[PDB]
Symmetry: D2
Subunit: 316 residues, 4 copies
């Protein structure tokens, strides 16, 4: 998985994520209208008046289990895979806001309007994992963005770490700090045409474009994707209209896409970019394409009786 | 630019390309019916009854100048940029079949039914480059594929080189031999899960997928792209239906796409994958998407009257 | 800087380090005999009966300021550069063993016989940096080894971290954890002859030796040296005599040597491997060569009235 | 194997090589006085009065078979392994000067005073490889240097290639052209301190020296070694005295030495830098150290009577 955020000139949110796995089924654009009543697993609180939210997910037990989701005030949250690092308490803590790991995305998008607001509340959050005997625990870290900035939430054995994500990108393992240090290896990688230069008597020139970018890794490991996407996000020229920012988003992501055959998982199955989802706060629209179909599909929030009362789950 | 060929299990051709540049030239899907009368610039001969052809290209002086094209009999060709290496005579040679560099793709698609045929005729072909005030010579090499195999044509100052392209992939500079040697650097790159090993007492394990692929370059240089796409094409699992094979084609070419901001050219503009086109002989359909719109559009030779006699530019 | 440790069959200590900087002067093989009276800066304690120690260093104020040193019972300590990470209190803590940063090497080698012993005492050590107004603080981390194992001492803002160094190598920045995670990128690098393999129809073979090792970085940055030396240390065959282990040591180090012209520091001067020092516990001998002279010089402890009373400083 | 040439500011030759292999052949320092009578195997002509020569090699049938050697007039030559590419006729060609592959180094050192002279004569040289039951042909290429410049001789199935070696370096396979193209991948690798830059809001800085050199491969493959040593040789600051230049030579060759355990050959043995030799025309001295002993031994032509008439193997 890979998440990405950036902005336009008018401080609109563009937030996007790859969902990378061997296979997926049943997930859907899923609307949680303002009229839906939501009972929080461990009686965490929330706004008297909930935000409309849209995202990609499944409904388990008439609750929306979001991979990623965004609200009508430009705030977006994606959960990404983090086993080996992610580590949670299994009991609520008295006098903290106790949020079940799977509702966390919904919670943050129902109740907050900015990263500022989210970050502030996190200071008193416990992220409870409820263990199911047959079912393996979801072990994630979270990329959260609005039109100004992103943060990274890494709950681990030693506690909850909330990072300012100055490169506006996230992947998988290992820790955010590691990835940030690692970037420094690549600090000389450039998008400029390679300047002619000499080694002794030998004149070196670039065949063409991309030579200054040499040193960037091209494998689909988590750290390499982190670096490649960080580079691409940071060097993509600012855009100023919706069409171009959604293009930006989707090209940026998928610059670290996982193609069939590239890379097997632990079980010997090839990991693939099964879908790419995005959110625009300019249009409060969610977008999506899949491995089987690159045509981007849009899901305007205003489409969408947000004053309604039940989860809507839209197919195709 | 990048070219890719593979088959399915029924000997059908899947062939396609990325056209990387800073600006479009007005190219379009371009049908050349069998009834179109074509007079080869240097009087190269031809099939009594030409093959139908479709491709992406431009009309200049009522001649189709294809970037890439394919015929009804499963043969496809792309021209890719090759300055610094491509070098041609400007005058026909007596006794040879003299083919203008710009008509070469049309010429092959129209007159040959297989790579065997083409390869055979190339032994008596001269590739002639017309000087045009005060445009620069177009200095390309060509990737040619059918259901069985691909070849590479590099006409250079030392003569015409025709290579068997065992990796079914082509990029830009330098020579084909260079690239094939270069691959050997990456022969330990693996799509398998990296297995646990120790350095001294330190046990090393992979975070997850893609660590075995570590070593593959991630930049958009010509050689880096050749290696990435060769890898990707050689590891992608064989597929058995049109839609999976088209998806295979496009994701494969996506693995080496150029994203805005990655790499400037010599004029200071970013090189980008403006479009990606493809061909299936199963369906005799041409496919295409663009930087602006990843939705793949199809253009079946069926939907056009190949008995007709005029050039058809199809706007999209 | 780079430190290295390994062992033979008979559990003798081999410990070595590169000293890397633009220039050095006045350092010397320096013997601290058992008869020298040592007044510890902050009244840290120590054995009634001190270990003989030998090392490379300078004497400031009739005290031995050791770069690296080793004792007569096979324990060795090297300090390596760590600015940006290393961070110390400037006042002694009551009821801890307070050890001045510059005496730390001497302290550990005067008073301990094993890594076990050192590690145990560290649990109650404060590492005080005394600031001198003109003089910039020495900001190091420490590689410590005996014939069984090595540890790494990183005193930083958040406290003292003492790592088990399972790869038996240390360099400079960033943190030991980072370096350990980073190694995982290289876990497929092999010393085996690259097995012939095929990408599609194309057969790939190795030109010769070293192809399986491709993916190892070759620059002289701290992280790259860490990886390169870790690989070389872990893959070097065990040796069983002194000559061969000192060879092992010195080849291993210097596999990450810094050559003039390679790499400028912050001040624009080239960083070089100015000397390489080592220690054998089989012979309680210290060895050394320099940039200007690769001939290894030996300094047998028994040479060397260790029951004497003053620092000896041996030149050439 | 690796070869290196540079000068000082007075036009003197500094020339040397790493001989990488699994096992020694019994080579020694080997003096060939002007009085030694030599009958070229295929009757190649020669200077009326031959140049004195010293080198490292073996005596077989009372003929000196040099790995490398140099003459009193500042000209040096090394043979380096080149199987897969080196290919020779086995019979002399009428009218050419036919030189046995094993006598080629002796032959050049004896008869020529400069690279200009040699290059000139190579236009009429045939390199002949004697079949020997049931030894394998020695399949080398040659690096030839004086005070001004180096050339590379690659006799292959398509003919004899003589290259101007503008980087003053040579390794093994593949062809020289390959390597020179390959260098262009690394044209942004810098010995400068990597300067602070930002990716988005993330400020990237270097830990210290060597981050600008990031991208240089660290493995001991032939191509990786060519790139590392080309880099190192081209960036090493010009030096002006014998000792600094010899130190320059040896550290430069050390940057691509093979350490035990790094890389197996096809027989399963580790390839190692068995010895490193060098030459100075300033002093007409040959230099050498070995895997076992990094102390550099000198062998001045002065200390031998070049008017004598017998081969002198000097044991070390």
């Amino acid at each position: 998985c890979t998440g990405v955020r950036f902005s336009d000139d008018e401080g609109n949110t563009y937030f996007g994520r790859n969902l990378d796995w061997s296979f997926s089924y049943g997930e859907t654009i899923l609307v949680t209208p303002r009229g839906y009543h939501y009972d929080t697993v461990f009686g965490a609180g929330g706004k008297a008046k909930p935000n409309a939210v849209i995202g990609v997910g499944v409904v388990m037990a008439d609750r929306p289990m979001y991979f990623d989701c965004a609200n009508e005030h430009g705030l977006a949250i994606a959960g990404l895979n983090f086993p080996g690092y992610a580590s949670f308490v299994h009991e609520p803590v008295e006098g903290t806001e106790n949020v079940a790991t799977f509702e966390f995305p919904l919670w943050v998008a129902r109740n907050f309007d900015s990263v500022d607001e989210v970050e502030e509340t996190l200071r008193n959050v416990t992220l409870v994992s409820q263990i199911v005997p047959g079912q393996q625990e979801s072990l994630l870290h979270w990329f959260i963005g609005d039109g100004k900035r992103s943060i990274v939430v890494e709950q681990m054995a030693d506690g909850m770490h909330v990072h300012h994500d100055d490169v506006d990108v996230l992947t998988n393992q290992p820790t955010f700090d590691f990835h940030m240090e690692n970037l420094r290896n690549y600090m000389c990688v450039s998008n400029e045409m390679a300047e002619p230069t000499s080694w002794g008597k030998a004149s070196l020139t670039a065949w063409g474009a991309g030579v200054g970018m040499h040193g960037i890794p091209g494998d689909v490991s988590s750290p390499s994707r982190f670096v490649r996407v960080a580079y691409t996000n940071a060097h993509y020229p600012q855009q100023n209209d919706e069409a171009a920012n959604v293009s930006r988003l989707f090209h940026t992501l998928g610059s670290v896409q996982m193609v069939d055959g590239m890379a097997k998982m632990g079980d010997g199955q090839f990991e693939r970019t099964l879908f790419t989802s995005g959110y625009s706060s300019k249009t409060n629209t969610y977008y999506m394409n899949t491995y089987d179909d690159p045509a981007i599909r849009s899901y305007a929030m205003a489409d969408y009786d947000m004053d309604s009362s039940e989860l809507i789950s839209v197919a195709r």
